[PDB]
Amino acid sequence: EGVMIKPITIQAEATLNDAVHIMRQKRVDTIFVVDSNNHLLGFLDIEDINQGIRGHKSLRDTMQQHIYTVQIDSKLQSVRTILKRNVRNVPVVDDQQRLVGLITRANVVDIVYDTI
Amino acid sequence: GVMIKPITIQAEATLNDAVHIMRQKRVDTIFVVDSNNHLLGFLDIEDINQGIRGHKSLRDTMQQHIYTVQIDSKLQDSVRTILKRNVRNVPVVDDQQRLVGLITRANVVDIVYDTIW
C-alpha cells in the first residue's frame, strides 16, 4: 500500500452544491463521502450529483453506498481484486473502516504494464 | 413485499463454512449477520477466493459497504437506482438494521418487464 494515494473527500452533511465546487477545484471525476471521523459512507460522481440536484435530494441520499474495499493491512496481492471486478476506484480502509487511501485501476494497470 | 429470503452466515463462522453454504443453496453470495440478525456484511465468490489466499478471516474479508433498503420502503422510490446501477443484491432491512429480506436486480427486471408486456 505504497501504491495508494490520498483521495478527495467530502463530509456527509455538506451540500450537493459544495460537492460540485470541490470536484471542480480538484478536477476529479469522483469523490468520497465520509463522516466527521473519516468513516467511509459513500461515493459520488458527477452524474449522481446532477441527478441529485435535479431531484432535490440530500448528499446522503444521493451517494453510492455500495463499494468494494481493501484493507490497509492487506498486501499488494489484492491486485486480482481490482482486475477481476474492474472498478475504477478502490478505497483503502483501516480496521475501523476509516478512509485512508485510494487505489486506482489506471494506476494498477500501469504498474503491471511497467513491470512487464 | 416482492423480496425473497436471504442466505446467511453467522459472523463467527469461517470462510470454508461459507463455501459449503453456498453449495447447499447454490447461490452467488451470502450475507453476514450477527446473533441478533443485524447485517454486517456481504460475500460473493470472488471475495471468498481471495480470502483463502492470504488465509484471511471472514470478518476481514467481508464487504461492509452495501446498498440497502427499508422494508417500509416503497419500491418505486428505489427501482430506478436498482436498474441504473450494477448492484446485484439489495438487502432489505428493518429500522433496526436487521436483515429480513432480499431483492435481486434480476427480479426487478423480471417484474417490471412482465408487468408491462
> DSSP readout, chain A?
--S-BPPPEEETTS-HHHHHHHHHHHT-SEEEEE-TT-BEEEEEEHHHHHHHHHTT--STTTSB-----EESSS-S--HHHHHHHT-SEEEEE-TT-BEEEEEEHHHHHHHHHHH-
CA gap B82, B108 in Å, rounded: 8
Give the residue carrying C-alpha cell 495508494: A4
Give CA torsion, residues A51, A57, A63, A64, to 10 deg: -70
Q: Which of B65, B85, B103 to mutate against chain A (most A CBs within 10 Å)?
A: B65
CB–CB of B87 and A66 under 8 A?
A: yes
What technique solved it? X-ray
Q: Which of A51, A62, A66, A92 to mutate against chain B (most B CBs within 10 Å)?
A: A66
Q: Residue A40 pairs with which residues in a beta bridge?
A: A34
CA gap A31, A21 in Å, rounded: 11
Give the residue carrying C-alpha cell 422494508: B71
Taking Cα atoms as reference points, which of A45, A44, A43 lies closest to residue A68?
Answer: A43
Q: Give the DSSP H or E segment for B49.
A: helix B45-52
* Residue type at position A29: D
**E strands within B1-117?**
8-10, 29-33, 39-44, 69-70, 89-93, 99-104
> Residue B73, Cβ neighbours under 10 Å: how many?
14
> Residue A66, Cβ neighbours under 10 Å: how many?
19
- What lies within 8 Å, CB to CB, of A14 at 6+ separation is A59
Query: Considering CB atoms only, which of B46, B60, B65 is closest to A67?
Result: B65
Give the residue carrying C-alpha cell 469522483: A30
- b/e A76-104 (16+ beta carbons within 10 angstroms → b): eebeebbeeeeeebbbbbeeebebbbbbb
C-alpha distances out from residue B76 to B35, B106, B108, Å: 32, 16, 10
Which residues in chain B (79-98) have CB-CB distances under 8 A to chain A?
Answer: 85, 87
**CA B11-B17-B18 angle, 5° bins:** 75
Give CA torsion, residues A38, A44, A45, A50, to 10 deg: -130
* Residue type at position B35: S
Which overall architecture, per CATH, does domain B1-117 show? Roll (3.10)
Query: Considering CB atoms only, which of A68, A71, A84 is closest to B60?
Result: A71
Nine-digit cell at B88? Answer: 446485484
Taking Cα atoms as reference points, which of A37, A38, A42 lies closest to residue A58?
Answer: A42
Do B46 and B12 contact (CB within 8 A), yes or no? no
Query: Does domain A1-116 fall into CATH 3.10.580.10?
Result: yes
